[PDB]
Symmetry: C3
């Protein structure tokens, strides 16, 4: 997956970012089985005041998570995952849950590429990982916390 995480500049220190990104990553791994290194968290910071709700300018406590996933998972599991992202980002960023917005979009695995390679259907990430070159396997596996 790619999780784009929209936040205000300086609301999250680098350690708070590490905390948020590891909580989203753990959630995704623990609920889907997808290996840690296939999950990107991509922080998009903007000056405070660029977020409006009902037309009202917000301080720096708004978080929007846009998760981009392969098709194939159940509504039940995606609900559980969205809920766990809300809870665990609330703890990790010390931000009340009421500030957190989370949207999941889905695409055919055949039109998504990570590390320059096409993804597989969910649940066949193991033999997909095994199919590819030793250099790629090594580069991927360094990307696990």
């Amino acid at each position: 997956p790619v999780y784009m995480v929209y936040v205000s500049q300086d609301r999250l220190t680098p350690s708070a970012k590490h905390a948020v990104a590891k909580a989203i990553t753990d959630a995704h791994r623990g609920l889907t089985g997808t290996q840690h290194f296939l999950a990107q968290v991509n922080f998009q910071e903007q000056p405070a005041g660029n977020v409006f709700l009902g037309g009202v300018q917000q301080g720096g406590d708004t978080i929007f998570v846009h998760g981009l996933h392969r098709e194939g998972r159940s509504a039940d599991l995606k609900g559980q995952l969205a809920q766990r992202i809300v809870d665990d980002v609330s703890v990790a960023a010390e931000i009340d849950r009421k500030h957190i917005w989370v949207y999941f979009g889905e695409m055919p695995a055949q039109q998504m590429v990570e590390y320059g390679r096409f993804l597989p259907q969910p649940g066949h990430e193991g033999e997909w990982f095994d199919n590819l070159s030793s250099d790629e396997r090594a580069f991927m596996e360094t990307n696990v916390d």
Copy 2:
């Protein structure tokens, strides 16, 4: 909804941003009936020069709106809403319609969370809001212009 609004840095003063957010939020409410405070406008600023059309670097005028909605509305209503965002953002930002691009993407409501809660189906914002607790009812009410 979340309306991601990509603009060049300093193209919109604080007052212009407020006006543009208001045009989008009032368009969404007026055509869908969804409450104002459920509409987010999230401005994403980047230096002029980061937008390319047909390979040609642009100045600071382009505006891209990526509206992210719940599934369930007709093509006709989405067309009316996109055209209204075009017209009203053209007015609010004193910008020619030819500079404005609008894309709507849709997601199951069961995988969309606002204010830490799962959204209802479109049109059921009323009972949804009537099952919300008093504090989150009030917090939501503070986000109306």
Copy 3:
């Protein structure tokens, strides 16, 4: 289309940005027939360290391309397009392919607007372009590289 390109600050100079935008636009035109001026490449730069892979903070070399397209193309064509984007951005940005992520999302053409006008169905771009006003055509034609 709109190609949202997420890169670290300064990883692409203005000239490298122009090259990448050209690689993507040429690939889209070559494989779909869609005229150059209908392809937007929108660079989103963030400070290095905002990308995490498997929870591990990254340097400045990751590139994520989020391409937003009209529905209607084959899985085969979209695979060819995405692969060519990996390859040609690899060359233009002088970057290892294993740094390049590419996701394609699709929307009904009836909810996509470019230059203030609703897009046609894929493969009807010539006819659509002919039926625009001459001021709109002329503005679009200025965007060809």
